[PDB]
Symmetry: C5
Subunit: 311 residues, 5 copies
């Protein structure tokens, strides 16, 4: 089999569509997601044209091997898609309608800057390489782009699935290449982060501040050091759910900042004890009373500054 010949000099237009059936396994660390979808293809092949009056048949069904089919690939996949051809239909004018159901693991970078209050645009890049006989170009049939109502991505809200209609046509290894960008817009369900990570982390921090209403050095050391260790556990827990980024994430910033608060609280607890031992408790009392206001106030202002810089 060979490509359909051009009537003039025009490139062959392959109309495409992706209909999402299943979305699963959005892996943050790997920056991948798995997809199960319909891929639809359409192009004119005049060699396949027939008479509907004499044939009595409106459509002809072909097996993939019987006809020429464009070699469509995904750019951002781990391995080549697992595909099963569903149908091939030819209209009397020779317009071919191809439909396959496929499954693939897609590589798509994620921006963790606003984590866990982040939104993402996942991409599925469709591609075709031109043949020596003729140039192949891709197009979007919007009537064949969509998603099943039941499509759910655990821990995410699916906003939209659209295609950028204009392909990116470019040369690669001395041939033309035609690339389409299918975009799946998602927003993270931040809910669970509140009772599981955020609030527990704030509770232990506030517990360390009870040391500002205590003169007992021994108890103070226990309060600040114990809660700091619990903070380390939360830091480790958070970093296991995320890849290593060349930038600060919102959660990372807060987690990092909280260490500074524990560090300064240890200095205060130390200074307080030192003055008490040096028979200067009135001074120690002034520092401790100031700390009761300073710590929550600086914590609130630093958080307002951070939220402002990140959102």
């Amino acid at each position: 089999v060979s490509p359909p010949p051009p009537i003039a000099d025009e490139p062959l237009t392959v109309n495409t569509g992706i209909y999402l059936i299943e979305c699963y396994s959005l892996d943050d660390k790997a920056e991948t997601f798995k997809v199960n979808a319909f891929l639809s293809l359409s192009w004119k092949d005049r060699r396949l044209a027939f008479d509907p009056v004499r044939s009595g048949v409106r459509v002809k069904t072909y097996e993939p091997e019987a006809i020429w089919i464009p070699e469509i690939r995904f750019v951002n996949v781990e391995n080549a898609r697992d595909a099963d051809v569903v149908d091939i239909s030819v209209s009397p004018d020779g317009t071919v309608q191809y439909l396959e159901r496929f499954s693939a693991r897609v590589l798509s970078p994620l921006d963790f800057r606003r984590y866990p209050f982040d939104s993402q645009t996942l991409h599925i890049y469709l591609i075709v390489r031109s043949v020596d006989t003729r140039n192949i170009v891709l197009a979007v049939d919007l009537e064949k782009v969509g998603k099943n109502d039941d499509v759910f991505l655990t821990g995410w809200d699916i906003e939209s699935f659209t295609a950028v209609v204009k392909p990116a046509n470019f040369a690669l290894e001395d041939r033309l290449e035609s690339k389409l960008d299918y975009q799946l817009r998602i927003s993270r369900q931040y809910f669970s982060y509140i009772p599981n990570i955020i609030l527990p982390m704030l509770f232990i921090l506030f517990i360390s501040w009870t040391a500002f209403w205590s003169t007992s050095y021994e108890a103070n050391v226990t309060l600040v050091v114990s809660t700091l260790i619990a903070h380390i556990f939360f830091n480790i827990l958070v970093e296991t759910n995320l890849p290593k980024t060349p930038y600060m994430t919102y959660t990372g910033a807060i987690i990092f900042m909280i260490y500074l608060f524990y560090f300064v609280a240890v200095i205060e607890v130390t200074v307080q004890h030192y003055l008490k031992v040096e028979s200067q408790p009135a001074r120690a009392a002034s520092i401790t009373r100031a700390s009761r206001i300073a710590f929550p106030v600086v914590f609130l202002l630093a958080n307002i500054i951070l939220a402002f810089l990140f959102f």
Copy 2:
């Protein structure tokens, strides 16, 4: 091969059945389960009809390639099922009886609201896409729906395996699609959660309340902070067995609430010490004595409220 032609304009009815052989790997985090079953198919193909007398047989056995077979798929699968055809039998009137043994990983959302005292309805959606030649509709042969007595799903009780007899017929990319819903009802074996998570979590909380029979600030700080950290360990342990949900689970609610009890116990321990230092122990004694009753009472009432809201 082509579909059986319609005598009038009728859709082709494909009778289905699923007989479960094995159920395994119900993954809560992934919201998947693995299945090994028999899939049975039946439809009328007049072109296959024969005379028993002339042929000298009452049944005819074909190879899948020799005859037309409907392209039946599962909607909610990760990848296409691994299937092996067992038998194809034709009756004199062209009634085809198809049997395959398959294995598949099924995506089925889970409701964790009542975890670990939850029940689920797992779905296996069977689907067929109509052809240009004819419309294909699915039906349930109840005599061919069932499960082996030995079918066990580790950590779950299997209640029933039934099919919703009326298919959900709908248009998808200008073709009729016929969808059947096979339902596997299961209930979680909550037993082990009691000695492993629930009771240990209650024991550490009750241990934190012994601080209401102690005047020692240093010992109190140790009792409350240590038990809080152990509570954080249980919270982390629980959240590892579950996906992130945009709602509160029953266990999640209790775990979250217990933090508030630890937070208020730290306030009480702090207030008690502060008053003792300020030479007002009679007051501190009133707060501590009230706490001995208030803490267990509020804990019991809050749990009754939560159980009521969740069950």
Copy 3:
């Protein structure tokens, strides 16, 4: 290709044998094990009869596709076995000798009641479904059932590999099925559980009992709470190696009981401090002295009772 025809009316007997080459990956949580074995099959197919004089050869060698082969399956497998035909030898009367080497992941439930001092009976169920032309039945050739001397299952002792000679013949979806039960008896190597989990857990418990020779409340709180937390770590460690069971395991029972001992030790430590503060140390001394005997005695008796209930 169709089944061999009956001389009279008898069912076709397929003689079977399983020879184990490798046993690996007994996964307690999944209740699976991997197997690499020889599957031997033997049946008479008179349509394959030949004259050694004419054909030259005394035994014919065939390719699986060239002849009829019974569709033998495993019941309790995750996916269909990976098999490679080693030989298909046909003798002059038409007796076929089939040999394949296969690998499979077998689902076989485990009884954890006596863990880690438990024994198991793993099953490999061989099955054949009857056809319309004729009924197929399975038999065991004991001369072809066995295991390699080097077969080792990490963490287990292999006792025996035998087959229940009588097949279970039954109706399934309006056709006969013939099922054979191959049994692999194993016993767990409990050795490592003693220095790794059992003894460390007993040491920390005995360490908490040193609080019965101390009047220091602060030190007592540290002894009992610290060792309790280490006990929680061991409980978590143990539960990670096991699935969730709707029953108590032997280890689970001991682990659970030890929590009660920690809970009562905290009560004793609290009661002792309370009386000391109330200027009644003589009483506190009576309770502490009784505790020195009561705790180890009740621990020993409770363990005798548990061992009796479980073994």
Copy 4:
């Protein structure tokens, strides 16, 4: 099919090119990386030559089975590459232009000496074995070596992708083998290690040094022992992201050294308490005051020495 015959006695030159499409999964522990790329091949096959005039075609397309294709393999792969032939074009003189898209898991050793401030040279070794008919040699077509601009390796910066033009020709199993070295130069994005591991580890160490401004043995024991345990947690965390090396890594060196600082701080805390109890606090005071300067100074100098030895 057989190799192209030599016009004289020359070896057959197979021109190669690798164009990287995707780079993912650089696993430090496994010392592997996954690659998705174009592999281009070019060689002259006289037997396939044609006259453009009598053919009416300027180029001829073939199926891989129709013509002789060199058996090109990768040396450093886990399993053989998953490849899909994209195009095979033949020019009039019989110059073949082969293009495949492949995916492979590459084994490439990593030098962790400067971790996490390390750079690596990943290798992809292309190989061909000679035949009895003729010697097959590999060459690099520099015009066909490259990478997509969007190629991103999570946690790394990609510097260059070049090929060593001269192949390594040698005998292997009595046939000559022609090996090409494709080099991917990368540098680790160390950013995240600073707020996640480095700074938290320094904060806890500095917190242990507050014991040099405290006379309280009980509080000192708590400060030093608690922070040491948190240091053990960071040591464990770091070692989980790395394979076991027969050398010291930069991070490993610092982590190890910090243990010595904790060990000496415990000695100081012990010596201080001992002298205090022995009624010699003036002495203890001299040791403690010296420690306040000595600990940070020796820490800074040891770090300058280490950075010097490693960079």
Copy 5:
């Protein structure tokens, strides 16, 4: 195709060789390793002999399907090897030279008795089953046994790769079987265990011994209990990198013994406090002073005894 016929009554000798290209994934817990190698086979097939002067060709290259090839398998593999035939060469006398490149996951038991100072002998067992026509026996061509210089097994030193030249010929299921033992000798790179596990474990133990220079019960309880818990963390860490063994490993023995030292240190700390409270500090002082010498001395002697028993 059928086997080559015997000239007299001799078994067919299949000469073998394994040349290691890659060694990776030595999994201690699973007792497996992955291998990528060349497998060479050689045997005489007279039915394939040809005239060198008449034919003009010195060697004939065949496709695997065109000729008879012995069915060679590996005994100790998880699944059948992934193999790709590289070349088949026939010399005039009919000597066949077969070469394939394969990848396999090999099951090979490991002796952990001396861990982490252990050495292992990994096995790759090659096997052939005889046919009815004739007996097939295996031999080693030492000229075709070896390994690439770049072969590295992360965390191990590769010593030698040799074959036991004499096959183990035995009857299995009424046919002869010929088995060859290929041995890969390796020694563990123990280096990293020293700064990561051994030294940190010794540091915490020595820190517990500072309690012998302290009269503070409260501080002593904190020193011994805290360090014991850190020892439990190291015990857990070590046991995660190892399978469960029916014997004691060297590291396991030391780890277990260290618990006894912590247990006796708690007794000493308890006895010391008890005597102090009973107004007998002179005695307590004798026990504490003896402990300062006894603990390190008994620790050193017990380690010399253990090293002697294990090495």
